[PDB]
Amino acid sequence: VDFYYLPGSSPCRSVIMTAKAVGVELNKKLLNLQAGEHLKPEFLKINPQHTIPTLVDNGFALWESRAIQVYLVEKYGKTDSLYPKCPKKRAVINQRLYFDMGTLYQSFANYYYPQVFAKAPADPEAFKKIEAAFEFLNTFLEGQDYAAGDSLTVADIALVATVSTFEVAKFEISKYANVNRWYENAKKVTPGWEENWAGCLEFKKYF
Amino acid sequence: VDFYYLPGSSPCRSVIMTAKAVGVELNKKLLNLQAGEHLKPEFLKINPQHTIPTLVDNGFALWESRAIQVYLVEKYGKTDSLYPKCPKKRAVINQRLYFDMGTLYQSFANYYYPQVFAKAPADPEAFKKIEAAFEFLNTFLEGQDYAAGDSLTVADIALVATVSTFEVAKFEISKYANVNRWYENAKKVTPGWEENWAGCLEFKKYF
Ligand SMILES: N[C@@H](CCC(=O)N[C@@H](CS)C(=O)NCC(=O)O)C(=O)O
Ligand SMILES: N[C@@H](CCC(=O)N[C@@H](CS)C(=O)NCC(=O)O)C(=O)O
């Protein structure tokens, strides 16, 4: 199973943690975006969208981190606890995965990427979207130890990658008590946490 | 099955078409965002994120359109053709669903929403992101009649909602030959197309 990635990338880290949780060995292939390695014909043949993470598993090329997470659980999970069979349980997880992409990580990208990638001054209105997203996550976690069910799921793992990126970016997570509680627990229970944190510190080099 | 929605909303329309495709009757409940009906305590108790679409199915409150689509197929589908059992088939569909959210519809929102909702002048750099997203979709559709498998899936239905919103916004879809071919076919085969198009024309009132 080939895995095209960089350690600093949040969506890559979500896959790293998920693979560790299911116990599937990845052939980790660094793909140097700053050198344009993802833009060369050899990579475009695998993933025409030229994004990381990309998985190539026995002929199957797959991208979108959250799709990769679910596929790894379905194929390699000795049990389905990270992504249970029940459609209702799956639906809550799926909702959280879309929240992670379209609300929470999107707010990260919209606020920090113009600063670190375009050298633009911080946009205080974009900052308010981060606050709104954390407020929602805080509500989702009211009375809950995990984000999308009774136990750790791929939704938690995706959210850990995102929230740890916020942590290294110096966002004050402590303001959101349920998020902080969930997050500090997640560090202790989530497979691959240490590797995720190493990657967050690599990402930090952009600040 | 309660369905909180507005006809003009693209993510709502994806659910409308999916429900028609699986043959599940929805109790359609208009939720007037301009009146703040989604912000009142009675709705926040159902969906604290105060978004449409929201489904309430026998006690289960669910939001995120693409999560709702999959849940409706899993629960009500007499067959699984719209979201097959095979994890590999599911993974491609899931990838496309994330593409629809995070690449294609995101490019719609980033370009048109500031214009129609904030009265800002058009941003030509944001326009280039739409072009990039259509280019990718055009490549995905090379040699393919459907977006994510041999037959119509929930990925096609989500993409139809998005691309029809582009159509009513006067984006020139014809420039992307595979997209245009796929889209014109999708109109003829996708359950609920007419209702989707009515909603696109309602959305058009914002232009
Ligand atoms: N929605 C994606 C995002 C992937 C993504 O944007 N990756 C970035 C790096 S963090 C990338 O490959 N950028 C290079 C490019 O798009 O050309 C996922 O969850 O996998
Ligand atoms: N990612 C979502 C987006 C839902 C969404 O943003 N809906 C808009 C209307 S098109 C909304 O409810 N806005 C009101 C709000 O967020 O307060 C989904 O696919 O369902």
Task: Answer whether B99 sits within 8 Å of A71, measured CB to CB.
Answer: no
Please tell me the distance from the alpha carbon of residue B90 to that of residue B75, in angstroms, as a whole number: 16
Looking at residue A80, its amino acid is: D
Catalytic, B81? Answer no
Q: CA of A50: which chain B residue's CA is closest?
A: B136
Of all atoms in ligand 1, which is nearest to the CA of residue A65? 20
Residues A206 and A130 in one domain: yes
Place of tokens 């194929």: A75
Residues A96 and A66 in one domain: no
Which of B95, B117, B134 would best serve as a mutation to test chain A binding (most A beta carbons within 10 A)? B95
Which token pair is B12?
């709502």
Q: Is A51 left (phi over 0), alpha (psi -120 to 50) or beta?
A: beta
Residues B108 and B172 in one domain: yes
Residues B70 and B97 in one domain: no
User: For ligand 1, is residue A9 a contact (CB within 6 Å)?
Assistant: yes
Residues B89 and B62 in one domain: no
Residues B113 and B126 in one domain: yes
* DSSP assignment letter at B174: G
Cβ-contact A191, A13 below 8 angstroms? no
Residues B132 and B201 in one domain: yes
Of all atoms in ligand 1, which is nearest to the CA of residue A51? 12
By CB atoms closer than 10 A (0-12, 13-18, 19+), residue A60 is middle
Please tell me the distance from the alpha carbon of residue A110 to that of residue A133, in angstroms, as a whole number: 12
User: For ligand 1, is residue A33 a contact (CB within 6 Å)?
Assistant: yes
Ligand nearest to the CA of A6: 1
Looking at residue B195, its amino acid is: E
Task: Answer whether B94 sits within 8 Å of A66, measured CB to CB.
Answer: yes
Which token pair is B26?
């929805």
Please identify, among A77, A109, A129, the residue that sits at the C-terminal boundary of a domain. A77
User: Residues 6 or more apart from B12 whose CB is under 8 A from it?
Assistant: B5, B6, B52, B53, B65, B199
Residues B71 and B114 in one domain: no
Length of chain A: 207
Please identify, among A77, A107, A125, the residue that sits at the C-terminal boundary of a domain. A77
CA of A162 relative to ligand 2 center, distance in Å: 21
Please identify, among A77, A109, A134, the residue that sits at the C-terminal boundary of a domain. A77
The domain tally of chain A equals: 2
By CB atoms closer than 10 A (0-12, 13-18, 19+), residue B174 is exposed
Can you give the resolution of this entry in Å?
Answer: 1.1
Which of B64, B96, B140 would best serve as a mutation to test chain A binding (most A beta carbons within 10 A)? B64
Please tell me the distance from the alpha carbon of residue A151 to that of residue A77, in angstroms, as a whole number: 15
Dihedral sign for Cα atoms in the order B6, B12, B17, B19: negative
What domain range includes position B191?
A: 78-207
Residues B69 and B87 in one domain: no
Residues A138 and A39 in one domain: no
- How many H helices and E strands in chain B? 9, 4
> Which residues of B make up each annotated binding site for glutathione?
9, 50-52, 64-66
User: Is A50 a known ligand-binding residue?
Assistant: yes
The number of beta carbons lying within 10 Å of the beta carbon of residue B30 is: 12
Cα A71-A73-A77 angle, rounded to 5 deg: 140
Cβ-contact B29, B57 below 8 angstroms? no
Q: Whose CA is nearest to atom 16 of ligand 2?
A: B51
What CATH number is attached to the domain comprising B37?
3.40.30.10
Q: Name the packing angle between helices B124-140 and B177-189 (round to 10°).
A: 70
Task: Answer whether B91 sits within 8 Å of A71, measured CB to CB.
Answer: yes
Residues A111 and A92 in one domain: yes
Cβ-contact A196, A5 below 8 angstroms? no
Residues B134 and B195 in one domain: yes
Helix, strand, coil shares, percent, chain A, to 5: 60, 10, 30
Method: X-ray
Cβ-contact A143, A149 below 8 angstroms? no
Cβ-contact A165, A200 below 8 angstroms? yes
Write out the DSSP string of B88-118. HHHHHHHHHHHHIIIIIIHHHHHHHHHHHHH
